[PDB]
Amino acid sequence: GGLTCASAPQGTLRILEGPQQSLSGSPLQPIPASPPPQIPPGLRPRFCAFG
Amino acid sequence: EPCGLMNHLTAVCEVVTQFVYTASIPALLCNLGVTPIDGAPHRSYSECYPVLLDGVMVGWVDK
């Protein structure tokens, strides 16, 4: 009436919960790159010679 | 005399200072695929990675 060893298991199942990968879009930056410093339009000379 | 010994952090670098629970992490790592230090790694202990979490070895995520 006691507990005895039974037949060895024939296989093992290991369960884990996993989600999946999306598409590669690689959206690097809101406003991207190093935007260049640049000329103010027209500007004009702010200096003249004497005479 | 202090060269190379007294450094300074970059502008974006920062020190971590918050303290969190980190108690539901060992139970999540097992859902993800880790097998507890207790047993049944499912491979050979050589094709398995020893998982550690803050000094405490959760144990042997498969390779």
Q: Which residues of B touch A18 (CB under 8 A)?
A: 32-33
Position B8, amino acid: H
Method used to solve the structure: cryo-EM
Q: Kindly determine whether residue A18 and residue B32, on different chains, have CB atoms separated by under 8 Å.
A: yes
| CB < 8 Å from B in window 6-35 of A | 12, 14, 16-18
Position B33, amino acid: G
Q: How far apart are CA A39 and CA B38, in angstroms?
A: 69
User: Tokens for A36?
Assistant: 């260049």
Alpha carbon distances (Å) from B2 to A33, B5, B6, B9, B10: 37, 5, 6, 16, 18
Contact yes or no for B9/B41 (Cβ under 8 A): no
Q: Min CA distance, B15 vs chain A (Å)?
A: 25
User: Tokens for B45?
Assistant: 């202990």
Contact yes or no for B34/B58 (Cβ under 8 A): yes
Count H helices and E strands in chain A, helices first.
0, 0
Contact yes or no for B34/B51 (Cβ under 8 A): yes
Q: How far apart are CA A20 and CA B44, in angstroms?
A: 27
Q: How far apart are CA B23 and CA B20, in angstroms?
A: 9
Alpha carbon distances (Å) from A42 to A30, A46, A48, A49, B29: 30, 12, 17, 20, 63
CA B11 to chain centre: 26
Q: How far apart are CA B29 and CA B35, in angstroms?
A: 9
Q: Kindly determine whether residue A18 and residue B33, on different chains, have CB atoms separated by under 8 Å.
A: yes
Q: What is the DSSP string of B1-63?
A: --TTTS----SS-----------SHHHHHHHHT---TTS--SS-SSSEE---BTTB----EE-
Question: Which residue of A12, A17, A18 is in closest CB contact with B42?
Answer: A12
Could you tell me which residues of chain B have a Cβ less than 8 Å from any Cβ in chain A?
30-33, 35, 40, 42
For this experimental structure, what is the resolution in angstroms? 2.9
Contacts of B45 (CB under 8 A, 6+ apart): B60
| Bridge partners, B53 (sequence order) | B56
